[PDB]
Design a protein around this ligand. Structure first.
Ligand code: ZN
Length: 315
């Protein structure tokens, strides 16, 4: 296809969620404790539906299975990624995501969940939990059992604009006061080790997966290294956050009119700030904060005019 494919958001309630998705993006949310917006999703538990054009109403799964041409004919049983907006009002659980092998073996073919975080906004003293100090799996087990979160967990102070890559196997948790654009593999495989003994809307504690978390966790933890790059042309500054095995993620900072080309299999796009006008051939497409869309394989060269910021990804 040759035109933008907009996606209608799906929402998920979370004990750590809030109303920021409605307050900052104008979204109609399910509850006053909404933690996640599954923005570009083909996950069975909450797939995005096409919001416009000839495919309006179809799910991203139906597009992947029946119209792979849209995605440049790339291989794979399922659309590979999942993009979310996260309203981390309170702390999320301490957890680890398995890799493709472990997930497939223990979660019935589910993909692993390597992911990354772009911090859109956050409070002044915001942090994240990333990595740990255990030198062996027996030590990790011991320190988790004595709830020595202070000696075990490693914390990183964050600020708006930060980017963190989270390889599967990484013990982590986003903490209270953060608004995040999370790009991850198409998976919902999560092993929690601690959830602060909280109760959900139904008065029941959330599930923990101690054994699986320890099995999936990388020990010892070693901080990986990613090199960012930035380049600018007329009307746009592009920051390249990562070009990894599972995805490449970028930030487009537009001011004025930028000339673009879609030279990948497809581009996943989220407008996180401002508004603008996308023009291609004789067509016009208004863009605004909160829009999520895919630019197909055959998308014609286009321009975006305005003051807006998008986070974009591709495989
Ligand atoms: Zn996570």
């Amino acid at each position: 296809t040759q035109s933008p494919i907009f996606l209608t958001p799906v929402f998920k309630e979370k004990i750590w969620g809030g109303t920021a998705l409605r307050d900052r993006f104008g979204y109609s949310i399910p509850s006053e404790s909404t933690g996640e917006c599954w923005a570009i999703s083909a996950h069975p538990k909450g797939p995005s539906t096409v919001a416009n054009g000839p495919y309006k109403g179809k799910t991203l799964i139906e597009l992947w299975e029946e119209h792979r041409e849209v995605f440049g004919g790339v291989e794979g049983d399922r659309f590979p990624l999942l993009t979310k907006l996260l309203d981390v009002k309170e702390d999320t659980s301490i957890k680890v995501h398995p890799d493709d092998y472990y997930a497939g073996e223990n979660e019935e073919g589910e993909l692993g969940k390597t992911e990354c975080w772009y911090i859109i906004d956050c409070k002044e003293n915001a942090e994240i939990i990333y990595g740990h100090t255990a030198r062996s799996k027996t030590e990790l087990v011991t320190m988790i059992n004595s709830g020595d979160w202070e000696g075990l967990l490693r914390r990183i102070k964050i600020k708006p604009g930060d980017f963190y890559y989270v390889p599967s196997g990484t013990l982590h948790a986003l903490c209270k006061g953060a608004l995040v654009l999370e790009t991850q593999q198409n998976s919902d495989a999560t092993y929690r080790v601690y959830d602060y003994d909280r109760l959900d809307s139904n008065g029941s504690p959330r599930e923990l997966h101690f054994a699986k978390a320890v099995n999936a966790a990388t020990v010892p933890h070693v901080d990986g290294y990613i090199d960012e790059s930035t380049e600018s042309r007329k009307g746009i500054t592009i920051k390249t956050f990562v070009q990894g095995e599972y995805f490449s993620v970028y930030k487009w900072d537009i001011n004025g009119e930028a000339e673009m080309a879609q030279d990948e299999s497809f581009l996943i796009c989220s407008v996180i700030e401002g508004s603008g006008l996308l023009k291609y051939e004789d067509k016009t497409c208004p863009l605004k904060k909160g829009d999520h869309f895919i630019l197909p394989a055959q998308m014609p060269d286009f321009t975006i005019k305005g003051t807006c910021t998008l986070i974009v990804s591709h495989i």
